[PDB]
Amino acid sequence: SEELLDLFNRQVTQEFTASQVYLSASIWFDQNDWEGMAAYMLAESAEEREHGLGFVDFANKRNIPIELQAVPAPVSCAEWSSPEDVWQSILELEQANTRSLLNLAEAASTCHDFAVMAFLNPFHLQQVNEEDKIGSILAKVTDENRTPGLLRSLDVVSF
Amino acid sequence: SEELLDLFNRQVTQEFTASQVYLSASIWFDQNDWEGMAAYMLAESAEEREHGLGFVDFANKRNIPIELQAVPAPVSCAEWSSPEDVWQSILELEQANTRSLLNLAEAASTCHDFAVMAFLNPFHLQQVNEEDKIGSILAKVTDENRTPGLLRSLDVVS
Amino acid sequence: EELLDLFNRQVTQEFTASQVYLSASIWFDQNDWEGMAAYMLAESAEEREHGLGFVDFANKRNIPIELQAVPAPVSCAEWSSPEDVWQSILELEQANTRSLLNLAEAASTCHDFAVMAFLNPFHLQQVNEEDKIGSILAKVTDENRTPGLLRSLDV
Amino acid sequence: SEELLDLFNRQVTQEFTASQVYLSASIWFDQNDWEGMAAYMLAESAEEREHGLGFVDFANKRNIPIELQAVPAPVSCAEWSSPEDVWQSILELEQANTRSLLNLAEAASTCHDFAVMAFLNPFHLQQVNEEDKIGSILAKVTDENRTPGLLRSLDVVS
Amino acid sequence: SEELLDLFNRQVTQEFTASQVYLSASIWFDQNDWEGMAAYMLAESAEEREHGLGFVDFANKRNIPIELQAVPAPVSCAEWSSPEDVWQSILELEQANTRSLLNLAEAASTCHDFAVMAFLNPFHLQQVNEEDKIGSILAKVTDENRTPGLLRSLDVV
Amino acid sequence: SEELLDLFNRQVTQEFTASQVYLSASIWFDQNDWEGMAAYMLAESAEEREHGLGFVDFANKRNIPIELQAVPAPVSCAEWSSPEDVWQSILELEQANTRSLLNLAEAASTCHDFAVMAFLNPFHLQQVNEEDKIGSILAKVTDENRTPGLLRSLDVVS
Ligand SMILES: [Zn+2]
Ligand SMILES: [Zn+2]
Ligand SMILES: [Zn+2]
Ligand SMILES: [Zn+2]
Ligand SMILES: [Zn+2]
Ligand SMILES: [Zn+2]
Ligand SMILES: [Zn+2]
Ligand SMILES: [Zn+2]
Ligand SMILES: [Zn+2]
Ligand SMILES: [Zn+2]
Ligand SMILES: [Zn+2]
Ligand SMILES: [Zn+2]
Ligand SMILES: [Zn+2]
Ligand SMILES: [Zn+2]
Ligand SMILES: [Zn+2]
Ligand SMILES: [Zn+2]
Ligand SMILES: [Zn+2]
Ligand SMILES: [Zn+2]
Ligand SMILES: [Zn+2]
Ligand SMILES: [Zn+2]
Ligand SMILES: [Zn+2]
């Protein structure tokens, strides 16, 4: 059925888009001397690409034809002015990855596609851990940034 | 030297664009049961991604501002009907990557940007190896494909 | 020949920079920034190795070297905080980058491909050092906004 | 003496001429994307040069004056249009290296030069092994080349 | 251009010519019982051949057509009489090959051939180290040969 | 007090001055193809700089203000024309540095500065060893330089 095929392709695009947006965050961090937060975003960019590639591989195995779409330019970088803005956009990015996965799971449930649902399970649990972790980092950032220089003092350690 | 900063940015785009094209080739091979050619392309896709990241890292160190551009949808895949069409497209892709590196070096030379020229030196030599390698694979593919089934034999001898 | 002049001058620049890093190490130590002082001391040794590297290449290439005086560092009398020191160190490295580029430009006019090849790893090294220094100065300047917080990070 | 000193010098030229012909073959193979055959010819070029050096070293010990001659430009490479042509020329090169050693041994025998004859023994036996190996490769080449693409699938293997 | 391709092809001939001239030096040293110097020249003959093979390999990768030329017979050897004569010819051989590399780089530079320039960099630096090493052996040889027999000491390396 | 703190400050200049003059000797030897003597001088150059840095470190610890002075250009190198000239200058350099440490210890002695005197003890014993070592190399050099070529054939050994 075509909607499942459509949503499956859209997931690939969403993971590669997340990959670029994480890469954009690394660059912002780096240009602004937050080497540790830049390292973390770089590692996450590589991880989102791996998610994308796992969907491509599953799709190839299951005969779901994939046609790669444009990966848009990240644009939030234009307006980030502190680490708190960057981490807030990364949280929103991950909340969007979770919504597209839940959409995909909903369509497969409708279609009684037990294999796609089994395939998605570890991704549902990984988004739980990912949102939890970003939420935690954002809480620390917005707390420590209430004292000048304190946040920097902790890029240096943690990350 | 706005020209240099522009060519440096576009170089990131070209490496990430090549990564996507290699990924599209890996998908087309996979869908047509060329698993060995698919893993080869998938490896090259990750490697093009690493090149781009290496440009980004250098640009960050040298205060060359990077803004990531869209990576366009690959479109050669619509038209491939055999492994030879894919490998031909990958050859032309690398020849465009080579051209683009050489343009960027020309711009660096003109600016006397010696750091940029030194940074590019190993990429120039890498392109020489990459085109040679593809050229040789395309020669073998084009020869073996003259007998039905024989090319299939050598996907597996990989 | 401007190329020989400049090559012999690069030796002096490296040893000059070695002494400026040693001066920074002294100011840090005297003001109880041991971490920062350790760091400048290791960079002082490193500049000296760059100078020895130019002397060795020149000897091999028959570029006559005559050692000049190594000028006294002048910036230390003015430094009042770690920000002043790291700022002067950034300028010192910028000056050295400029001087390696002018050397490479003379070598390029003369078609001296060997000297150009010899300089390549130095050009790339300067890019990494200016980046590292810029990044440390950024942290210093941010952390110094809260009394005593910078100390937390030397240590 | 005379005849023996001249032939011993000529043998040095012959080994190094052979080294260069093998190198010409490696280049032709490489330019036409036969990497495995190319590697084999490169490995043989180095080994011919070693034979050459072995003669020089023996001559030096036995006070035979060596004057190094021009090593001629390889010319068969102008004519090669497939792998079979290259292997054929290599087989004929080795049959002439064999002739040259046998002629040397002949002059040594006449002069009753037992040390020279002892020195050449392993080379005569090595020529037997070389002509046999090349004959056998040329047989396989000319058999595989009867199906388009098949030869290529076996540069890749062997 | 014609020129850059002619020069690359010739550079192979240059490295193989240097290989034979080092072989000719080893032979002269061996015939004159300078075993240590003979072994040095023999190892340098192999290395020049490796340089030539390095150019051939690059040329194949880069589609620069190579046709091997004759490697001329070594000439200096007929007139060497003492180790100083040999070392001086070897220095001159190395100086010539440095000029031949700089001329190739210049041709590559005119054509904006960045790949050939990059490929050449380690060879330019290698020449600097070779000329230096030979110049220094030659200074020692011409100093020790002032006392009869003493230079036999350099040889027992 | 003033005189002691000044002499301590200027001991740093004397060590760094000695470092540069060793470096200059290493350059003269290298330029004249005495690589063995050049390596020896280079290593002593690094050692004189470590002695300087030992003074700086102790001064930092004992709150003796250090103001780094110009390190003078070495000038003996303009008149050196044989290895014996270089080694004789190096000997005078070390005798000068010994006198310079003894004066420092004498000022510390008048000041009852037991810490400085303890700090200096191993430097005094090091100067003894260095003078003896250089005296000994100089005697060998002067003796061997009586026969042309002979000194050369001992840079090579050592
Ligand atoms: Zn960075
Ligand atoms: Zn993650
Ligand atoms: Zn994901
Ligand atoms: Zn994610
Ligand atoms: Zn598959
Ligand atoms: Zn690759
Ligand atoms: Zn690339
Ligand atoms: Zn590529
Ligand atoms: Zn201290
Ligand atoms: Zn430096
Ligand atoms: Zn530096
Ligand atoms: Zn090849
Ligand atoms: Zn063989
Ligand atoms: Zn042979
Ligand atoms: Zn043979
Ligand atoms: Zn011998
Ligand atoms: Zn060479
Ligand atoms: Zn050479
Ligand atoms: Zn030297
Ligand atoms: Zn000392
Ligand atoms: Zn001393």
Numbering used by the authors:
A (entry chain B): 1 to 159
B (entry chain F), D (entry chain E), F (entry chain H): 1 to 158
C (entry chain C): 2 to 156
E (entry chain A): 1 to 157
What is the paper's account of this structure, in its own sentences?
A novel ferritin was recently found in Pseudo-nitzschia multiseries (PmFTN), a marine pennate diatom that plays a major role in global primary production and carbon sequestration into the deep ocean. Ferritin is a 24-mer that forms a hollow sphere, takes up soluble ferrous iron, oxidizes it at di-iron ferroxidase centers, and stores the iron oxide mineral in its central cavity. Sites A and B comprise the conserved ferroxidase active site, and site C forms a pathway leading toward the central cavity where iron storage occurs. The structures confirm the typical ferritin arrangement: 24 subunits assemble to form a hollow spherical shell.
Zn (1 h)refers to the structure of PmFTN from crystals soaked in Zn(II) for 1 h. Zinc ions are competitive inhibitors of ferritin and bacterioferritin. Crystal structures of Zn(II)-inhibited ferritin confirm that this metal binds to the ferroxidase site and site C. The zinc ions are coordinated by the same residues as seen in the structures from aerobically iron-soaked crystals. Furthermore, overall Zn(II) occupancy of the three metal sites resembles iron bound in the presence of dioxygen in PmFTN rather than mimicking Fe(II) binding. Thus, the use of Zn(II) and likely other metal ions as analogs of Fe(II)/Fe(III) may not identify the correct binding sites in other ferritins.
